[PDB]
Structures are given as C-alpha cells and as structure tokens.
Symmetry: D2
Subunit: 485 residues, 4 copies
C-alpha cells in the first residue's frame, strides 16, 4: 500500500475519473447546504483558517466534500480520511482530490485517503496518511474528528512513545485493536517521537459525534487531553437535528437499498432511545411498522412509552423481530445467542458509530455460513436451526454503509457547527484550556436561523416590552443555558 501522487497531491481513492459525477452532486449539495455557503460568504475576506493544517477523520461523503471545500475557501490546508471502512462515496472522494476547477489529469484539490470497502489494515494506513503531513517541520496543527479515531491514534501513540514500548495485543482482543497496535508498533521501530511531536503541534480538536465525545470525556478525566476540544455533537442544532431528523431520513434509506423489505406491518426492535433511536422509531412508525424499543435509561424509556412504543428487553423481543436496529453507542447489544434466536430472514443492522453493538466477531467464528448477496448485504445461515439472517454492512453504521448517510440539508447544520468550532479554536485558541467545550447558544441559534430562512419560515421579532418581560435581548439568546428544546 503506497499513496498515489498526481500533480503534487498525494491521495488514495477508488477512481479519479469519478470526479465529474462527484462535482455535479457537490454543486447540487451546495444549494442544500445554506449553512456552509453562508459561512464561505461571511468569512471569505477574513480568511480565518489561514495557516491551519487540518487532519480530518470523517465519512468521505458528498456532504463532507462541501465541508472540506468550506475549510479550504476559508484558508485552511487539509488532509482527509473516512472514519468508517464502508461510508466513503467514491465520486465525492474523487471530486475532493480534483477540486472545483481541476480535472482528473490536472487535479487541484486536497489529499484524501478513502474508498468504500477498505480493510481494517487499509483503514488504519489511511488514518496515518491523513495524520502525517509532508514537511516534518510542519505537522498537523488541528484535528477534525468523528468518533475519535484520529484523536485516539495521536493520544495513544504519544502514550506508548513516552513509555518506550507499544504493548502486545492479547489473542482475545478485537481485530481492529490488533490492527491499530500493529501500526503504532511498526512505526515505533523507525520513528520514536512521531506522535509526541504531532500531539504537541495540534492546537485543538473538534468532535462531531456522541461516541467520540464520550471518548474525549474519558481522556480528559484521565488527565490525558493534550489540547482543547470542542464537543460539536452537543450543539443543539447538531444533536437534535442530525442525530434525530438525519437518522429519520437515512435509516429507512439504508434498509431500503440493502433489502427492499416492506416496513409497514413488520415488528421492529430499536435498541436505544436517544436522539438516534428516536429518529429510527419515528421513521419506522411513519412507514407503518409496529415498533418496540429497548433502553437502560428510565427517562428515555418513559419518552418511548409516551410516544406509543412498548419498552422491552432484547431477550423477550428478539424472537419476534422482523427488523433489529442497534442505536445505543454502547457495546454488546446483540450477542450471538440473540442472533441465533432471530426468526428466519429477519434483518439485523447497527446505526451507532461502532460495529461492536452487534457481536460480529462471534457470528463470524460461529460456524454460520456466509452468502454475500451484494455489497454490504450478507445472508448468514445457522446449520443447526436452518435459519438465515440478513446482516447489513457487516455491523457498521448502515445508513452510510448501505446508502448515503444523512441528506445535505441536515448535514448543513452539523457542518456549519464544525466549521464554526474549527474557526473558534483556531482564531481564539488562547481562550481554551485542555478541556472539553461546547459552542455558545448564540452561535447555535445563528445556525438555526440560516436554515429557517432557507426553508421559507418567518420568525417573529420580539417587541421591546416583550424582551424585557422575558428577560432576553431582542437578538437572543432566547433560552436559559440548561434549556433542553
């Protein structure tokens, strides 16, 4: 595995000749991303990210391409990889390397190391490529992360360097961990302070998703967070719109392309009822499914029941479920005994960040036989019961695996928030300690306002007396800090 180089740009992608297709969809997406397009306009003169060297680890989609090109319009240099082995849209990756005025023979874009259907070894090689800038005097100085893999590589890397050794993996370790440690160990043989130096160069990280935010909280509580982080997941305009309405769009899209199964009339088990599980349940309910929900949290469980759903355990419900979706951000939700309990020709997938919600290692070592139907759709048969289960995307987040993830208008919210966070952390870096921050409410309301306007909504303007009555400025922010929407 060696990078391709064309016109001084290193990259590794499926097919550069897809760029023309990619560029057409990027141009359509620009129309549906008023959040990103409005920031390009506002900040074009300013060039706020001049001097930034952004290493981004985030699903390489059409929507992420509009994000990358917003960061470049604003002055940044970037290097990119996908944060999932199946989530890259190859036409979009091609268009990013080529750029808006380039061609396949004369590319003018940025380094991308991403393609749909990477191996675990390829996935971590690409991550390192993305994190490794060409000039050893000029390493990465910002991270843009989705799920924390980039942050993990730099932070665990420095840890092993400081300790003089990369540990062995245990044989019972998850495959991906073994792959990951192998990369660190191999690099340690030839370069002894790689990750330490990169960690000292990173000015901040912006983290897009619930799972990665959890991991940041875990680093920070260990005293191991080496630079400022902005939790972009928990922008109101992100968590409450992307995780919820995005999923409401793209869950059924993933299931449609993977299976073409009728959803109406089917028993559907959704595991977890946070923002993700809420959109799942709503999408399924809208299509005529009979939905039940699982939960550990009594508050989220009570919401599920008030929304018309039984709240049940996997053990009691799994045998009746026509479709099973894991939405928890936890591990060990659907174990091999659960999968063996499923009815014949039931569908199983995961829409949480990591594949470990489903016991895929157990199913693979089970003695069940695998028949591939098409990309990211496998029929698994158990010889002892004779029952076959359809598994989507090998357990990896199925909306991006089997379809195209959330729609542009939704990602416009999430990516306007990331762009704002990148701009804040870069230009105002000396206002942040080595802690996890969220964006102020006035910026979340700014992102909302752009999208209401684009949809044709008419906001009401408070009169002077009304603002005084509420104790707010006419221009916001409108809600107290703990307000939950």
């Amino acid at each position: 595995l060696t990078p391709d180089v064309r016109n001084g740009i290193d990259f590794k992608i499926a097919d550069l000749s897809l760029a023309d297709f990619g560029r057409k969809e990027l141009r359509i997406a620009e129309h549906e991303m008023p959040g990103l397009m409005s920031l390009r306009r506002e900040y074009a003169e300013v060039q706020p990210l001049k001097g930034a060297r952004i290493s981004g680890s985030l699903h390489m989609t059409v929507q992420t391409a509009v994000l990358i090109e917003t960061l470049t319009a604003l002055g940044a240099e970037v290097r990119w990889a996908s944060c999932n082995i199946f989530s890259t849209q190859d036409h979009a990756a091609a268009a990013v390397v080529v750029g808006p005025h380039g061609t396949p023979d004369e590319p003018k874009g940025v380094p991308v190391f991403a393609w749909k259907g990477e191996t675990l070894e390829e996935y971590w090689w690409a991550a390192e490529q993305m994190l490794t800038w060409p000039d050893p005097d000029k390493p990465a100085n910002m991270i843009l992360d989705d799920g924390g893999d980039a942050t993990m590589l730099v932070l665990r890397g420095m840890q092993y360097e400081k300790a003089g050794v990369v540990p062995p993996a245990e044989e019972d370790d998850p495959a991906e961990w073994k792959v990951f440690l192998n990369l660190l160990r191999t690099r340690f043989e030839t370069d002894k302070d790689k990750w330490t130096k990169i960690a000292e160069s990173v000015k901040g990280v912006t983290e897009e998703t619930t799972t990665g935010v959890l991991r940041l909280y875990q680093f920070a509580a260990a005293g191991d967070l080496a630079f400022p982080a902005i939790n972009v997941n928990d922008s109101v305009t992100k968590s409450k719109f992307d995780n919820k309405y995005g999923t409401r769009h793209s869950l059924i899209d993933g299931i449609n392309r993977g299976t073409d199964a009728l959803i109406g009339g089917k028993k559907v088990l959704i595991c977890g009822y946070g923002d993700v599980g809420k959109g799942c349940a709503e999408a399924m309910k809208g299509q005529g499914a009979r939905v039940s929900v699982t939960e550990i949290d009594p508050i989220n469980a009570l919401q599920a029941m008030m929304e018309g759903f039984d709240v049940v355990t996997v053990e009691e419900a799994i045998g009746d479920a026509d479709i099973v979706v894991t939405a928890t951000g936890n591990k060990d939700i659907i174990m091999l005994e659960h999968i063996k309990a499923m009815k014949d020709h039931a569908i199983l997938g995961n829409i949480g960040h990591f594949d470990n919600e489903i016991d895929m290692a157990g199913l693979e070592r089970s003695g069940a036989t695998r028949v591939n139907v098409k990309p990211q759709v496998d029929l698994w048969t158990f010889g002892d019961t004779g029952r076959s289960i359809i598994v989507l995307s090998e357990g990896r987040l199925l909306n991006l695996g089997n379809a195209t993830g959330h729609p542009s208008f939704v990602m416009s919210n999430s990516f306007a928030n990331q762009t704002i966070a990148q701009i804040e952390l870069w230009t105002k870096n000396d206002e942040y300690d080595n802690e996890v921050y969220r964006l102020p409410k006035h910026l979340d309301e700014k992102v909302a306002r752009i999208h209401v306007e684009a949809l044709g909504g008419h906001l009401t303007k408070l009169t002077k007396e009304q603002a005084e009555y509420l104790g707010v400025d006419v221009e916001g922010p409108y809600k107290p800090d703990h307000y939950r929407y």
Copy 2:
C-alpha cells in the same frame, strides 16, 4: 369575604357536600399516580416533613388533592389556594377539606381557599388566607408555588414594608395588579411587618412552572430572593412530560368541552413551540388539523418545520385561522387588532400560565358585545365587521378552565418531583443558599423509573463491562449533565 370554620378547619370553597364525589375521584387518581403513592410508602416511617408548614398556591384539582395528601402523609401541615380563578375542581376542594376519613359534618382535612369562578378580588383574598397561618408565632415556613403568585405576594409585600409605603397604581395598570396592590396597601394600614415576618420564616420555595421559574430568576438577579428555591419545572420528568404530553392530552379536551368544534380539516395557529406548543401541535396534528406555528426562537422554529409545520407570523396567518392557541409564556401575543382580523366564528384561547398572552383588556374595552354561552365560553361580536369570536376561559389557561387540566398519570411525574423537592429543601435546608437549584439527575431518574414500571415497561440493565464502556454506574445516572433528551 370571611372564612368558614368547621371542626377547627378554616376554608372557603363552593360546596362541602361535594366531598363524597371528590373522594371517589381522588381514590381513582391514587391508582394513576404511582409517583406520589410510592413516596407515601417510602417515607411513611421517616416523616420527613414533620414541622413543615407549607403554603401552597397551585390549581386545586383532583391531582393537586393527591399531592396535598402526600405532603400530610409525610408529616406536613398545609394551607392551600388555587393559582387561577377558573382552575379549581370544586369536588376535589371539598374532599381535601374533609380528608380521607372525615365527613362534611366532621371534616378532618386541611384549609383550602378555592372555588371555580373566583373574582380577582376573591382570588387575592384567598392567597392571603393561604399564606396567613393561624398562630402569629408559627408563620409559613415553606412555599409550594405554580406561577409565582405566592412568592410575589411575600417578596413584594416585604419590599413595600421595608420602604414604608405601598405604591399607588397607574390608571393603565392591569386590573389584577391594581387588585394585588390594594390588598397589600389595605393590610399595611393595620400590620406593618406581616410579609417581612413571613419572608424571614420561609425556609424555601419549590416552583412548578416555566413562568414561575422565570420570575424566580428575575428576583435572584435583583438581589431579592430571600430563601432558597428549587426549580421543579426543569426536572426532565416535568418539563418534557407535563408541559409536552400533558398539554397533548388536555388542550384538545378544553377545546372539546368549550366548543365541540371539529378539529380535523381546520387551520390551527399555535403561538410558541416550546414544550407546551410542541404538545399543542402534536394533539392538533393527531386530530387532523392543518397546523402552523409562530416562534421568536430559530431553534424551536426549525424543530417545528422538521415536524411538518409552516412557521408564520400572527400578522400573516391570523385571518385564516379556525382556531388560535397561545402557548408562549410571554405577553401581548394576540392583540385587539388580531382579534378583529379573525374570521367569523373562529376560536381563540390561551394555554400559557397567565391570561396576558391575549389582549383581554382591549377586547373588553373595545365595544365588542359579549354573549355568554356557558361557563368559560363567550361569544364576542364586533358591530363594524359583524363577526363573532368564541373566546375560552376569558383568556385564562383553557385546559384547566374549560376542562380538567392534565391527567393524573402525567401530574404524578410533576408532583413526585415537587414532593421530592419539598423533602430535600426541608430536611437539608442548610446546604442551600438563596439561589435557584434544580434537582440532581438521579432523582429525576427515580421518578421516571416508577412510571415506566407502572406502565409495564421493562428496563434493560447494564453489564459491568457496558457500564465501564459508557463511564456510568449500572444504577445511573446515565447521561451527562447537559443531556437534553
């Protein structure tokens, strides 16, 4: 007006002979309020509220009666009044005075000053009764408030005593403000220190609703909050359940009893899309309404659009609305000009805490003529256009004015939070400063767990491995502090 006294209990209510009917509905309600019944059992031996003398200002309904009888079961003495002129359920008021083992001839319950259809003057006389305990050496030492009227009475009262004069009112003050000052001004002529003594005796206030919580944040900003306060509105199990799913139930109930108007096929305008407006929109949508929404907050506005509703102004939409509902907690939403814009036989109501959302003073002074249809339903005719508007509850919150407010199972959440807050504030008073607090998450989780259990929900339990992965205890709390559900 003078109180009635029977068997040493002072009260003022419509009809003590309604006690038998009241008791029946209280007993039914006990079955639908596991949150309150669970607290009675748990704290029965402890008697945590022994010594408390709670002045309660809160809609005197069946649900409130079960709350009162929880506080007395747990050791408190109470005196009660309603926080709205139209919200009392007379049978429930009678049952509280009589108590579970009393009769109308031998009552064994608590002082209540409340009936449906109070005048403004009577409303404020009753609050004064409720706040004035019989032994001058043993004044109120706890307030339980809904909308802040009791708290306002004590704090403005003490303010004017400290100043040595009660302000005169301006001719352009609302009627209710004039009434309120008249009360304080009258009492100050014969008792110069009444409210100061009460204010010093009060060890804390618990506050049930958004409007009241705002007024608390406004007092604490002014240097003027004399005792700790718990913000019960913003327990997750209150705001996200009472304000939303409560209103989903009781908005259409109030409209039904008042008008029997078909909702399917009608255009409905909901002003505000916070928790209350969300419930409103959801109920109306479920009945086949064509719902549009008004908002000042682009985040809430963007949620409304994502839920299938146009976001519009009162100015553009008012002429087309079959039904108009204010849900803002703000004032001056529907002014005289808007009411005159409304189509013939359109319906107008408020479900926010105070009647000032609608310009009732302007309508009553306008020269429109009023025909009363039935209690809390009035038909107003404008002579110049010839159009008639149906107004519900004279602008007072219509769910409680035209119907019975939220159902028992919902109030059980709110009132379990209220009871917990009373217990915490009473038994641990020294741990609190003169600030607004919210309950810790683990107590909101406790409340939710009781109700999930009661409905037949089955919670999943985290393994030690899962809990470690998530950074949580197996027993909660399960979410970070800023989690919005």
Copy 3:
C-alpha cells in the same frame, strides 16, 4: 307517564327553560353545518317536504336539532324521539320544542319526547309518542331512523297484529325485548290495527347507521320491508367521514369527560376495524397510545397491520389492556369472563350502536358490586380478585353518553345526506320499490363539495381534454360506481 301540552305542542323533555342555552349552541352549530344551511336556501321556495309527517328516531343532540329545523324549513311536519337512553342533550331538546321564535311559556317548535337518562320503559313510551300522530286519519307518512328501532316497532307491531297475538317474552330474553313486547301487547288490548295502519301510511324510511342498515337488509330478505328505504350510512360522505373522522373526535372526548385517564403510554385494545374502529385507533394513536386491534375480517385486519397495529384476539390482549373499546356492530364481544380477566382500574366502553357488544347482563348478575362515580361512569369491583373496572355509559355508545357525540361539522355531512334522502323519497316516491337504495354518486359529491368549500379547499376543474381522457363529465361524477375511496 303522560305528555305535556303547551300552545298546541305535545312533548316530554327535561326542562323547557334550557331553551335559551340550547338556542345559542344551535346558532353556533348552524355555522358549522354548511351542508344543512345550503339545503335550507336551495329548497326554500320549493318546499319539497310539504305534506310530509316525519317521525324521527335519532339522538336528540344540538346537531339533530339543526337537522329538525331544516326539515321544518323545507315544509315537513315532524315528531321526534332519541334512539338512545343517554344520548339526548337536554338543552337541544328544549330549543327544538320552543322553536327559533317561541318561548318556554309559548313554544313554537315541534313535539320532542326525549331526555338524558331514560329508563327502558320511558324510552319505548317516547318512541310510541313519536310514531303516533294526533289525527288518526293523518298518521306518520315517513320515518327518519338511526339504529332501526322505529322501523322495528312499526314492522313487528304489524306482524303481531296480523298474527292476532303478541308473543310472551322468553326468560333469557334481554330486558329491553321484554319492555318492547310489553308496549305492543298493552297497545294491542285496545287498538288491534294501530301499526298496520301506520305501516300502510309510511311512504319511506331513511336509515342513518350501519346497524340499522343491516336490519333493513334482514327485513327485506324476509320479504317484510313494507316501504322503500334509503341506506344513508353507505353514502361515501357519511360512512368515510361520520363513522371514521367523527369517531376520531368523539371517542377520546367521551373517555376524557368520563375518566380523565391519560391515553399516552397506555395499552389500548380496539375491537373491530371498520370505519368506527379505524377512527378509534387513529384517535388513540394520535394521543400516544400503544394500540392493538381485534378483527374477524382478514382484509380489515391487514389494513390495521399496515397501519402499525398488532392484530390480536380479546383473550390474548384483555389481561394487559388499560382501555378496551368495542366498535364491531356485533354482539358478545367482551363477555364476563373477559371483564374478570381485566387489570385493576382498566376502562371498558362501547362505541357501536347497541350495548350488547358488552355482556352488561352477565356483569350485573356476576356478584361484582357497582359504585356510581357520576352519570354514565360506574366502578365495578370483583371481591374474589380485588380488581375494579370503570364501565362507561352502562355499555351504551360512549361518545354520546359521556360527551356530545360527533361535532357539528361532521354531522353536517350525515345530515345533508339524510335531508336529501328524505326529499328524494318524499318527492319521487313512485320511483322506488320496497327495497334498500343508496343515493346516487353526484349527490354524495354535492355534499362533499359544500364542505370542501367551507374549509377553504380549492378544487381543480378538469379541462375538456382531461375530462375526455378520463371518460367523465367536468361536473362529475368522477369515479366508477364501485370506487372505494
């Protein structure tokens, strides 16, 4: 029991002084009933109902009152009674007897024999009063019927007159059949051809509901239909709108006023998924209920599954239902064995035409004890289990018994169909045989058009080319005769 007579009108109602309150709601209802009002204008000069002496058996509500004064506006003379012992709105009965221009002292309306809370004896008495015109040479010449009770009295009465004997009642016959036969037997002692002469005078019947229609098909198949009948239920604008959307409104209204039980979060069982069951399920779903459905018809069952509802038997679901509603038009749906299986404080009600959907007779003889809570709400308790059930309206149709039935706007559809059917049979009587007929499609479209317009719907007009391509006239009808909508 003896009729009152006042100013030349015989009647028996609760209270004439309710006339003013009734008249206000009648005038409000007129605005919500453009189907009826349009007909009054269209047929004002024509007087198509001159000569007609109409005996109506139909729930004496505000809506029926506007139907009555439409019939009189078009020339008819009427006599009225209700078709249910709990469905009369006493204020509407008073306004009908009084008239738009009468007073309680000098009434100028029509004979009404109806009040809320009739006994079975009083009910059948009133139905005889309604079918018995004062001049014996001018008997009833038309029937307007709901449930088929008036038609049954006339046709059975004649049958027993011809047989020379009214047969004794069987011991295990329902209480009401015993009362119905008493009425006939007692009248037959003194008047040997009363019902023959009325049945010979009746030119036609119009039947407004599914149950009455079934009985008309039954009479006609025995060769006992003495006059032509119009099936008004099966007009598209009746069945698809009244039975379905009317019920979506009034089912939850009845349950609210009777119990104030939270619907969200609760398990609800609907028996039957015809138009009524469909309306029930949708209402319940819209409020956050977890709905299951029972059915004998696999077509209606498949629809319910496609609509997100488990299809289940009474036996499997009864134990866990919080609310149970029967909507089948059939008998013996919830038997005593089921009621004994129900959970503590579960709610039981019927919304089909007759109370025999529920085994009330079994419950009354079971040894369960009854506590009345308020009118049409009874708590029944089994000492053996200690569990209690709330029964609504003694198993009588709960929407009209616990609330006000369907809203004016919906009833406007049904009652325009009935007015048109009355006109058609009266004026074109010799065009009909003694069979059951449905109105022609263009008259259904006519009724629909009126209400689309009233709601602000904008119809598109076919071009000449389009209408030719579809094979229809620009003015309709637009659908083939078997079209199901």
Copy 4:
C-alpha cells in the same frame, strides 16, 4: 434488432451473467411473497394453467420474476416484456431467462425481452417479441397486462387490419404514438392479419392497474373488447394495499436514490388524492414534510383536508413547492408554464402509470437545457430565470425508474390476485362474456388472510350466534358487495 437464442430460449436482456445475483434476490423475495408461495403449493398437483401461453407486459422486477415462476410452476408457458422503458431490474431479467436450475450458458428459464433504459423503438419491439409466439399457428392465448399496452397493440392492431390500412403518424401528437403506428404499419406490409389471429386466440386478459382498467372500460364501451377481462386493480387487496401502501414505501425510495434530498421541513405538492396520492401524502407526512394536495374530486379533497392537508391548485402552490409529485392517472398536470414557475433546485416527478402527467415534450422544446446527473436524474436549466429543476426518470413512474418499485410483500397481494384471475379466466373461460369483471369477495379475503397470518396477525372466529347476528357465514365473505373498507 434481433433476439438472442441460447438452448432453445429466445430472449433480449442486458446481461445473462447477472443471473446469480438475481437468483439470490429472487430466493429472498420468495420468503416475502407468501401469497405467491401458498398458490404454488395449493395448485402444484392440479397444474391449472397447463395449455396456457401467457404474454405478460409488466415491469420486469424481482417481484414479477417470482410471479413468472409461479405461472410456470402452475403449468403455463410465458413470454415477457416490461411495461416501462426504465423499470426493468436487469438481474431479475437474467434469473428468469436462466431459471432456477439453468446456467448463463445453458439457460432453463423463459423468454424475456427487457432491460433498464430502452428507447421507445426498443420498448415497442420488445412488446412485439413478447406477443409473438414462435409457432404460427399456436399464438398467445392469454394476456397479463399492466397499463394496457399489450391489449392496445393486439386490439388496435386488429382494427387496422379490418380497415386494411394503418393511418399516417402525422406531424405532431406524441412521439410514442408515432413509434407504435410505425411498428404496426411495418408489420402490416408483410403480415396482413397478424393481430386479428392473435386476438381470436386470446381467451382473456388480466389487467393490473387503474390506468389500464380505465382503458378496458374505454374499449368495452366502444364495443371493441374482443375477449373477457379481469380488473385486478380493483381487488380490495390490490388497490387498497399496492396503490396505497406500496407507494407509501416506494415513493420516498425513488426520491432518495435519485436525489438524496431531505424531505423533513420541505413543502411537498402531491397532485391527486386517490390510492396512490394517499400513499404519497402519508409517506411524505411521516418524514416530516409540509404536504399539500390537489384534486378534482370533492370527496377525495375532503379526505385530504380531514387528513391534515391543504387542498390547493397547481397554480397557487407550484411557486413554493420543494418537491412536486403527480399521482393522477390523467394528463397535462404539470405543464411547461408550471415548470417555469418552480423554485431553484425543486424536484419534479411522476408516479402515475404514464409520463404524460408531466409536459415533457413542452420541456424538451422550451429551450431549457438538460445536464444528466446519473441515470434517471436530469438537471434542466432555464437561462431566462437562471433557475434549475431536477426531473426524475424523464417523467416516467419514478418509484420503478429511480429505485425498485414496491416491496415484495406488497406485490405478493397484487400478484396473488393476478395469478388467481389468470386461473379463473383460463379454467372457467366459458362463464365469461366480452366484458370487464372483478374477482369475487371470498378470493380477496383469501389473499388477505395469507398475509395477515404471514405477519403474525391473529384473526378472531365468529361464533355461530355472531355470524347469524351479522347475516354472514363464519368463513365469510364478511362484507356487502359495495363495502369500501
């Protein structure tokens, strides 16, 4: 163009090597089509279609593949073509040619003339191939039709042979009409009575869709219906399930794959509110869209209003619509003038049987310019306004053109009906005249029962007393002939 031949099969498909993939999807579909599988078993020994030579014109999808191998399993020979240029799934075509036991090199399936993306020339050539059986001598004896193109070819073809002349194309009128006449006139040169003889030979036709049924009523009314026809569309289990629920599934799938446009928050315009329009509205609403509906029929319009949708004309709503879908079965819905009024990047599509709902010919002549994005997705730009429109599938039914059409479980209803009608007409042919017939109710109930059971629905069985009460047999049918569900 010339058919391929391998191993005694003539065919014309994209690629035989796609058989393996096709066969996997076919085996998955068999599990989702219990209506078809139940019929294979029921009639396996009987072989009811022995002797039938069926010419089927129907979208060549995985579902139709399972119907084809049902017909052959039952003793028929078949020849197949798709009824739309874009709706063929190429891998299903290959699996049908190859058969369940053949190889790409020695196929053991049946003749198929179909690929995704035919020209109008190719479509009509394929239609002729499908209708022309190899033995002179032994021509088609059964037609299975969808849209009525096959029937039109046979019946109009005969009409010109009786006249002795195929008329001139003309300068204008549709481009497709020209192709159709061209094909006929070319054949008339060499074979003077081809179509007369095929028509004489055809015993009956089964017609799958509303549009083709309308065209049958048009032929029959002319007196030109040459053989018996079964109207399959209007089986209750077809129209109320396929047209409504299948569309609810496949409309958003089409739009998703074509555009990935967010549906939530967008204004959507659905033209027509019959079964397809119903399903369209419901899908969009479930995804959070703001839906409006157009109609010519006041009954259907009144339904849409009661379902929460404004009823509007194209002219009033076109300017603000984000997405526009035609679902009428009529022509000239969205004319060029409308397309010019649409907003920038609005999406336009048709889901009715034919493309003429949308003025494609006017668009193509208007001077707007087309950029192809990917197959069945075109961006058209008007240089005068600078605004662009996305058009799906060149205005052909978008669900099959941009995705996969309705799911197998849905198609299992329609295709069980089709198979049954084919058995009825083939085995009981002498009992039918040259008229349009619908299947009896018991057969509809039969189909629904299979799917209810498949989904785990549990029907209740009437007692003998209940069935007596309703006037029905325990085994059904349960409803009167005119019942609308």
